[PDB]
Amino acid sequence: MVMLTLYFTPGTISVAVAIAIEEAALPYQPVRVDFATAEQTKPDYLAINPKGRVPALRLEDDTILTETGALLDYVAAIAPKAGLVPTDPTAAAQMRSAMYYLASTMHVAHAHKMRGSRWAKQQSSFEDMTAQVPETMAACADFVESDILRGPYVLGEDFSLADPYLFVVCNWLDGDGVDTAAYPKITTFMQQMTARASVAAVKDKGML
Amino acid sequence: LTLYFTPGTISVAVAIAIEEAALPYQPVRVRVPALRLEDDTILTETGALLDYVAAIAPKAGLVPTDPTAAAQMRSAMYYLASTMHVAHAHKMRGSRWAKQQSSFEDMTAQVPETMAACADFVESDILRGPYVLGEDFSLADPYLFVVCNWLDGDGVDTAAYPKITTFMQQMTARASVAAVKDKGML
């Protein structure tokens, strides 16, 4: 295959990978996975990603990769001229700290809104977990504001892989009952991101 | 390097990587892990710390030079960070996401099922064998080792997972694992 194929769903974390591919100036083929019919849970998609999640990335040799953070580092690795990962190990580690925080904590908090059935069986448990999301996401936003976002981007002046990842997650905040406006650095960050060519490109492709 | 860790937690995976890289470090017992650099920079998140260790000791070969294999390694690491450790965390840290005692009982009761499902995925789709990438050790391996160590306690019988069993046996034989055991890290 000449180009990368990205399996994605609008409004999901898969969009972070699309943003990175756009920043890398690489051609790619987006494939929409339709949550409205639970396409991600069906045999055809499970043959692509047995975990039943987006994103998944199909490489030129048909290898399938999964996990947003891994795909972001992959894009950087195949497009070094985009400068998406700092050469300084400390700065790159701060970039990855932000990414793993999003993967392990902030996305996970968001996931308890609609995917409570991953960890519980009772309806009352789902209602309990759903009710806590505005508070858990606000606490995550607090940490982003104080300990992740140097400003304007995660690493400060320099855009990096942490930024598309953070952007897509922070895009969930209003919908999760958290005012992004209450966080000045997050607000400035979202304004810079919204103005970038990569983000305009994915919007034009119907991803946001 | 100063590493803040707690025995029997995921922070130990970082110590294992530092041992593999043959870097000197001062373990400080206490989230962990946290890594204090000489300029007093504090770095956090296991997966980020693992890549940091490989970045400062490139001759250790802890990350494949092939970007595909490196992405497969990181896929395993993010899976552990986002799914398997998370599933485990609902056993005793359910209060992160719920308030009602009935929700905690529900969560507790699912842990053997969620952890077994993760073990199934590890066995079939992460662990090529003997290590994550096959014959070649990588950053994914210390991460997987510490997480798989929780399986028995979470109600999952590892004996029924032959690749996980082989993997744990190979890890136990490594100098890095013997070293963190010698330091009381577990």
Ligand SMILES: N[C@@H](CCC(=O)N[C@@H](CS)C(=O)NCC(=O)O)C(=O)O
């Ligand atoms: N740890 C995974 C999370 C992937 C994930 O959960 N994606 C969501 C959308 S944001 C999904 O596919 N949900 C489908 C479902 O749970 O059925 C990653 O970072 O790639």
Ligand SMILES: N[C@@H](CCC(=O)N[C@@H](CS)C(=O)NCC(=O)O)C(=O)O
């Ligand atoms: N996303 C973090 C998770 C760190 C974490 O949760 N560590 C646990 C031990 S495995 C902890 O420190 N828990 C403290 C607490 O819950 O009180 C990472 O992978 O580094």
Ligand SMILES: [Cl-]
């Ligand atoms: Cl700066």
